[PDB]
Amino acid sequence: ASKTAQQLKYIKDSIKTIPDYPKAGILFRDVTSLLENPKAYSASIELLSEHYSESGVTKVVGTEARGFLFGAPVALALGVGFVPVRKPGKLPRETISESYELEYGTDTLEIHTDSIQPGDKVLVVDDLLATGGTIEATVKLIRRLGGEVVHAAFIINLPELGGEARLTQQGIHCYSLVSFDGH
Amino acid sequence: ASKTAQQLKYIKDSIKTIPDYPKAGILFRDVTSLLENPKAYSASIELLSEHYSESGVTKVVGTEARGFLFGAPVALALGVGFVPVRKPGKLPRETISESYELEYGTDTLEIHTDSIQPGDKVLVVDDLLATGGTIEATVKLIRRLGGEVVHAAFIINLPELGGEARLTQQGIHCYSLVSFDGH
C-alpha cells in the first residue's frame, strides 16, 4: 500500500536468518545483512525518524555498538544530539554507571553525566529487543540525570524473550519495525 | 567563505579538549562533544560524503565502535552498503581476522568474508587517526577478500603520532577534517 508498508516488507526480507546459531535451535536474525543493503538501511532510518518527528525528542541515546548504527542516523535525521552509552572505561568525561545481567554474568554501561539534563526528552534506539537488559539499565542512567525517557525504538523485536513486556511495564512505549518469532 | 571552510571551523570548535586524560601531558580530543552538537555532527557527515561523492566507492567499512558513528552515516549518504569490522566473536557469519599491536598487548578485528568481493571499492571511515594500527589491520582484511581500498577518512588527524605516513606507505590516501597537535 503506502510507501511505509512496502518499505517494512523489504526491511524484514533484507534481514537474513542463520539457522542453529549461536546454538542448535536458534534462528539468528542477522542485522548485518540489512546494513549492507543500502535501500533497507536507509529505509529503516527513514521510518524510525518519521515515527518520532512530532514526539518532541531532544536527544537520542544508543548503546555500544549496534545501537550506534541506528541511533546515530536517527539523531542526525531528527537534528538532535546523539549520546552514546558505553562499555565501561571508554568515555572520557565524568560518568555514571548501571549494571545489567548477561547469560553468564553481569556487566556495566556508562553515560556522560554532562550529556543528559533535566528537561531532556530522550529516545533510546537499538537494533534488536531481546531480554531488554541493556535498555532497562540505559533508562536508569537517563533518569538519574533528570532526563525523561518514555520511548525506545528497535529494528527487530523478539517478543518471546520478554523485553517488550518488561519495558512496557516500566513506562517505556516500545516501537519496533519488524518482529520475529522464536528465541 | 565557502560552506566548507566555515563548517571546518565550527567542527573543530565543537570538539572538547580534556587535559591530562588518559594521563598527564596528554590533551584528549573528545569527539563525543561533536556527537551531541547536531550542527557539527551533521556537517561532519556532509563533508565526508561530499568529498567521496565521485570516488566510485561501493562499500564503506568502519571499525567498532566510534568508527560506526562516522562510517555508517557516510554509507547512508553515499547510498552504499556499510560493512562493520568488529572485535572477535560478535559477527555471526564466516569471518577472517587480523591481529594488531596495542600499548599493552594485542587485539584482533574481524570482517564477514561475504561482505567484500573482488572488485569492491572500499572507503574506510574512523573517528581519529593516531598510530594507524587498527586501520592498517582493517585494510589488510579488506584486501585479503579482493577489495580495493585506497581511501581512509577521519574526523580528527593527530599528525605527530605517525598514522598518516604509515598508511601512505600502505597505499592509502588519508583525508581528515581537522587536525590537532600533541600525542
Ligand SMILES: Nc1ncnc2[nH]cnc12
Ligand atoms: N534469534 C536471535 N537473533 C538475533 N539476536 C538474538 N538475540 C537473542 N536471540 C536472537
Ligand SMILES: Nc1ncnc2[nH]cnc12
Ligand atoms: N590526544 C588524543 N586524543 C584522543 N585520542 C587519542 N589517541 C591518542 N592520542 C589521543
Ligand SMILES: [Cl-]
Ligand atoms: Cl553490539
Ligand SMILES: [Cl-]
Ligand atoms: Cl571505539
Ligand code: NA
Ligand atoms: Na547532567
Ligand code: NA
Ligand atoms: Na568475499
